[PDB]
Amino acid sequence: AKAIA
Amino acid sequence: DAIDALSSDFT
Amino acid sequence: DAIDALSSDFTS
Amino acid sequence: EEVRQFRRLFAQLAGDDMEVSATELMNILNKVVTRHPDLKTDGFGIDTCRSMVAVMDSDTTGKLGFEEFKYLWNNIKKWQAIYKQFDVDRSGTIGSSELPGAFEAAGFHLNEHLYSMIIRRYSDEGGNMDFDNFISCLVRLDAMFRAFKSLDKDGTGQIQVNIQEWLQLTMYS
Amino acid sequence: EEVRQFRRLFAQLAGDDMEVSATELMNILNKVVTRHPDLKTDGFGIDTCRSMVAVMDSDTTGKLGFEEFKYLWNNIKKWQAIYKQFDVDRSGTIGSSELPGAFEAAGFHLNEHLYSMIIRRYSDEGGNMDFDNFISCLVRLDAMFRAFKSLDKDGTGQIQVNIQEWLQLTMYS
Ligand SMILES: [Ca+2]
Ligand SMILES: [Ca+2]
Ligand SMILES: [Ca+2]
Ligand SMILES: [Ca+2]
Ligand SMILES: [Ca+2]
Ligand SMILES: [Ca+2]
Numbered sequence: 090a091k092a093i094a
Numbered sequence: 095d096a097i098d099a100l101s102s103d104f105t
Numbered sequence: 106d107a108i109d110a111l112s113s114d115f116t117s
Numbered sequence: 118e119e120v121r122q123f124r125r126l127f128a129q130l131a132g133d134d135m136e137v138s139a140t141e142l143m144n145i146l147n148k149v150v151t152r153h154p155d156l157k158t159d160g161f162g163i164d165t166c167r168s169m170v171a172v173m174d175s176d177t178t179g180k181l182g183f184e185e186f187k188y189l190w191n192n193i194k195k196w197q198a199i200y201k202q203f204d205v206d207r208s209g210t211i212g213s214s215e216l217p218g219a220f221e222a223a224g225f226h227l228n229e230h231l232y233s234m235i236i237r238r239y240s241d242e243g244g245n246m247d248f249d250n251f252i253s254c255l256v257r258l259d260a261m262f263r264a265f266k267s268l269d270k271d272g273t274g275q276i277q278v279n280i281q282e283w284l285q286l287t288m289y290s
Numbered sequence: 291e292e293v294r295q296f297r298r299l300f301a302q303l304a305g306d307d308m309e310v311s312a313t314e315l316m317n318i319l320n321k322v323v324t325r326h327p328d329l330k331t332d333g334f335g336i337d338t339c340r341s342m343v344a345v346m347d348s349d350t351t352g353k354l355g356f357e358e359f360k361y362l363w364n365n366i367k368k369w370q371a372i373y374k375q376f377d378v379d380r381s382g383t384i385g386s387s388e389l390p391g392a393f394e395a396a397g398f399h400l401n402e403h404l405y406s407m408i409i410r411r412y413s414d415e416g417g418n419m420d421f422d423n424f425i426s427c428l429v430r431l432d433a434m435f436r437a438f439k440s441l442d443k444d445g446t447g448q449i450q451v452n453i454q455e456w457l458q459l460t461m462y463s
Contacts, residue, residue, distance in 0.1 A: 090365075090396065090398060090428075090432035091435060092280075096129035097145065100149055101152045103194050104194035104195075104197040104198060106302070108318070108322060111322050111363070112325045112326070114367045115325075115326050115371075162337040162338075163332070164337045164338040171410075231458065231461070234350065234461060234462040237352040238344050262457070265453055274452050275450045275452050276450065276451060278449060278450075278451070280438055280447060284434060284435075285407060287430070287434045287459070288404070288408060288411065288427075289407040289410070
């Protein structure tokens, strides 16, 4: 449930 | 009535 | 009761 | 030509945007299963239809264009034919013992671990699978097998995916 | 402790087998959301619930044991508060322009491309997402992130999977 970049 | 067409296509 | 408990976990 | 005929039929099903939305698909479908009591089912849910659409929406327009609808429908009618073949006891549903045969018939060769998960995800409390679950399951299975292939050079047997691709593949399904 | 109480509560929700099935989850979630009409929803469909259960069913038992349910409920609890936080116009739904913020508030950071597909798959004609779609989407998004991370390790950020595993991860979800 966290992060993209 | 486009349904009956589809309704007939499958046994 | 079980539902009461869960519902109260919902804010507002 | 059937495609021309189906094209004229499709037009009556799509409307303004010339594509079939999840809501439109659901209604077309439920109006059809209704005309077939021998097919046990509590109708295609809106979420199930959204899932089928997404999975079929290769060009990501959000709805089903003619080709996508034609593909989907050709699969449903044929899988529907298989459905009736395997509902031996005319229960309106497919038995768990008959399910592996129904699948093989559809052309799917999965088993052991795989199959058990399928049953688990689409079967009823007794292992029996009804129409909407049967159809939706195959639509997805077909979509996934196909989605896998389309990501393989020469089928090294494995696909490498990053986070964006993974979320795209799994969230839009 | 507070946990021992939830354990006690889970027992009431689990029933005899001590696990929450898709059907139980549906009735439970619908009994809760109905008591909060400020959360606009057509209700959690059986299909959406089988999918939520399957995606949370790490130990593939077909239902949700204590720990899975607790994880799920803690997430719903938290996301439910975020849902209220971002339903700024009090329409009962999460507007499309408020959605990126809500996802971010849930710790999710995607991009225009993901949100577009998310909207496409989970919002209504107006770009609005009601409560069950919002919750089901995040349950899935959270599960898919964990799936990736777990399949990775500590770097790469680009997993590889064969057909057996791909069908597992996609069909049982
Ligand atoms: Ca349309
Ligand atoms: Ca499309
Ligand atoms: Ca049968
Ligand atoms: Ca139970
Ligand atoms: Ca489980
Ligand atoms: Ca709103």
